[PDB]
Design a protein around this motif. Structure first.
Motif, PDB file in Angstrom:
ATOM      1  N   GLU A   1      34.396  24.025   3.856  1.00 56.71           N
ATOM      2  CA  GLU A   1      34.371  22.700   4.212  1.00 56.71           C
ATOM      3  C   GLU A   1      35.292  22.063   3.417  1.00 56.71           C
ATOM      4  N   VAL A   2      34.891  22.122   2.135  1.00 51.31           N
ATOM      5  CA  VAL A   2      35.282  21.468   1.026  1.00 51.31           C
ATOM      6  C   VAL A   2      37.149  21.455   1.202  1.00 51.31           C
ATOM      7  N   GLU A   3      37.394  22.708   1.125  1.00 46.43           N
ATOM      8  CA  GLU A   3      39.136  22.938   1.157  1.00 46.43           C
ATOM      9  C   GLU A   3      39.634  22.346   2.300  1.00 46.43           C
ATOM     10  N   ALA A   4      38.898  22.203   3.379  1.00 44.36           N
ATOM     11  CA  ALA A   4      39.403  21.700   4.752  1.00 44.36           C
ATOM     12  C   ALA A   4      39.379  20.107   4.375  1.00 44.36           C
ATOM     13  N   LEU A   5      38.465  19.496   4.008  1.00 43.47           N
ATOM     14  CA  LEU A   5      38.441  18.070   3.794  1.00 43.47           C
ATOM     15  C   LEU A   5      39.316  17.659   2.776  1.00 43.47           C
ATOM     16  N   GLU A   6      39.701  18.532   1.684  1.00 42.24           N
ATOM     17  CA  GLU A   6      40.542  18.207   0.629  1.00 42.24           C
ATOM     18  C   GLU A   6      42.044  18.097   1.355  1.00 42.24           C
ATOM     19  N   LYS A   7      42.289  18.848   2.170  1.00 38.36           N
ATOM     20  CA  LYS A   7      43.505  19.218   2.905  1.00 38.36           C
ATOM     21  C   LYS A   7      43.770  17.703   3.600  1.00 38.36           C
TER      22      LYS A   7
ATOM     23  N   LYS B   1      33.071   9.942   6.695  1.00 36.21           N
ATOM     24  CA  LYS B   1      34.001   9.140   5.975  1.00 36.21           C
ATOM     25  C   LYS B   1      35.423   9.604   6.457  1.00 36.21           C
ATOM     26  N   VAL B   2      35.784  10.907   6.053  1.00 37.84           N
ATOM     27  CA  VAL B   2      37.097  11.186   6.259  1.00 37.84           C
ATOM     28  C   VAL B   2      37.628  11.286   7.776  1.00 37.84           C
ATOM     29  N   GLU B   3      36.627  11.493   8.433  1.00 37.08           N
ATOM     30  CA  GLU B   3      36.808  11.592  10.043  1.00 37.08           C
ATOM     31  C   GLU B   3      37.053  10.301  10.443  1.00 37.08           C
ATOM     32  N   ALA B   4      36.399   9.029   9.853  1.00 36.37           N
ATOM     33  CA  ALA B   4      36.478   7.737  10.322  1.00 36.37           C
ATOM     34  C   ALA B   4      37.802   7.343   9.825  1.00 36.37           C
ATOM     35  N   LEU B   5      38.262   7.682   8.490  1.00 34.44           N
ATOM     36  CA  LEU B   5      39.585   7.532   8.100  1.00 34.44           C
ATOM     37  C   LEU B   5      40.777   7.801   8.852  1.00 34.44           C
ATOM     38  N   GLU B   6      40.679   8.993   9.255  1.00 34.68           N
ATOM     39  CA  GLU B   6      41.624   9.886  10.368  1.00 34.68           C
ATOM     40  C   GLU B   6      41.859   8.899  11.550  1.00 34.68           C
ATOM     41  N   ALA B   7      40.831   8.456  12.229  1.00 36.01           N
ATOM     42  CA  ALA B   7      40.850   7.763  13.486  1.00 36.01           C
ATOM     43  C   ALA B   7      41.431   6.354  12.980  1.00 36.01           C
ATOM     44  N   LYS B   8      41.070   5.680  12.034  1.00 40.84           N
ATOM     45  CA  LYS B   8      41.451   4.359  11.657  1.00 40.84           C
ATOM     46  C   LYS B   8      43.071   4.355  11.161  1.00 40.84           C
ATOM     47  N   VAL B   9      43.371   5.566  10.578  1.00 41.41           N
ATOM     48  CA  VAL B   9      44.779   5.613   9.978  1.00 41.41           C
ATOM     49  C   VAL B   9      45.676   5.759  11.429  1.00 41.41           C
TER      50      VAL B   9
ATOM     51  N   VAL C   1      38.358   9.561  -1.400  1.00 38.44           N
ATOM     52  CA  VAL C   1      38.137   8.955  -0.136  1.00 38.44           C
ATOM     53  C   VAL C   1      37.639   7.497  -0.142  1.00 38.44           C
ATOM     54  N   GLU C   2      37.280   7.065  -1.226  1.00 31.11           N
ATOM     55  CA  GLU C   2      36.743   5.840  -1.497  1.00 31.11           C
ATOM     56  C   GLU C   2      37.954   4.776  -1.754  1.00 31.11           C
ATOM     57  N   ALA C   3      38.973   5.333  -2.399  1.00 30.14           N
ATOM     58  CA  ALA C   3      40.243   4.408  -2.529  1.00 30.14           C
ATOM     59  C   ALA C   3      40.939   4.386  -1.377  1.00 30.14           C
ATOM     60  N   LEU C   4      40.850   5.351  -0.386  1.00 29.06           N
ATOM     61  CA  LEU C   4      41.375   5.301   1.044  1.00 29.06           C
ATOM     62  C   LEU C   4      40.817   4.352   1.619  1.00 29.06           C
ATOM     63  N   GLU C   5      39.414   4.384   1.680  1.00 23.74           N
ATOM     64  CA  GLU C   5      38.613   3.245   2.524  1.00 23.74           C
ATOM     65  C   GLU C   5      39.065   2.118   2.074  1.00 23.74           C
ATOM     66  N   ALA C   6      39.381   1.498   1.000  1.00 22.12           N
ATOM     67  CA  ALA C   6      39.444   0.219   0.549  1.00 22.12           C
ATOM     68  C   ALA C   6      41.283   0.060   1.151  1.00 22.12           C
ATOM     69  N   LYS C   7      42.142   0.977   0.920  1.00 19.23           N
ATOM     70  CA  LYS C   7      43.445   0.778   1.237  1.00 19.23           C
ATOM     71  C   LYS C   7      43.583   0.756   2.796  1.00 19.23           C
ATOM     72  N   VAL C   8      42.683   1.196   3.427  1.00 16.63           N
ATOM     73  CA  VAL C   8      42.888   1.321   4.919  1.00 16.63           C
ATOM     74  C   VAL C   8      42.094  -0.124   5.410  1.00 16.63           C
ATOM     75  N   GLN C   9      41.121  -0.621   4.703  1.00 13.03           N
ATOM     76  CA  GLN C   9      40.679  -1.769   5.223  1.00 13.03           C
ATOM     77  C   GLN C   9      41.594  -2.965   5.125  1.00 13.03           C
TER      78      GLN C   9
ATOM     79  N   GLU D   1      28.635  16.108   3.698  1.00 14.78           N
ATOM     80  CA  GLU D   1      28.425  15.779   4.885  1.00 14.78           C
ATOM     81  C   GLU D   1      28.778  14.343   5.226  1.00 14.78           C
ATOM     82  N   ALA D   2      28.414  13.419   4.229  1.00 15.67           N
ATOM     83  CA  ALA D   2      28.967  12.073   4.454  1.00 15.67           C
ATOM     84  C   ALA D   2      30.197  11.791   4.080  1.00 15.67           C
ATOM     85  N   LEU D   3      30.991  12.640   3.069  1.00 16.10           N
ATOM     86  CA  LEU D   3      32.161  12.578   2.954  1.00 16.10           C
ATOM     87  C   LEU D   3      33.061  13.000   4.225  1.00 16.10           C
TER      88      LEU D   3
END
Lengths: 33, 33, 33
Positions: B1-7, C8-16, A9-17, C3-5
């Protein structure tokens, strides 16, 4: 798994920025684009 | 949740890789861009 | 951490999603691009 997902996720945040900066530059025609 | 987040993260990695390729192509003017 | 990840993933989905729309518009030359 969570430790690896966090790194991904952190690598994605950098790439998306980076993409946001490049795409805004294209949309705005910055620097002769 | 982790399984869904991973996908979700894996889907993002694919989408971001695709965007990087398209944006580099625009920045470089590849193939007549 | 999960919870934080997740946030972060949801924010990435919107940005992407936003980047995909802007990049398709650039590739297609929509709206005078």
């Amino acid at each position: 798994e969570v430790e690896a997902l966090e790194k991904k996720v952190e690598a994605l945040e950098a790439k998306v920025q980076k993409l946001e900066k490049k795409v805004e530059a294209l949309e705005h025609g910055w620097d002769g684009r």
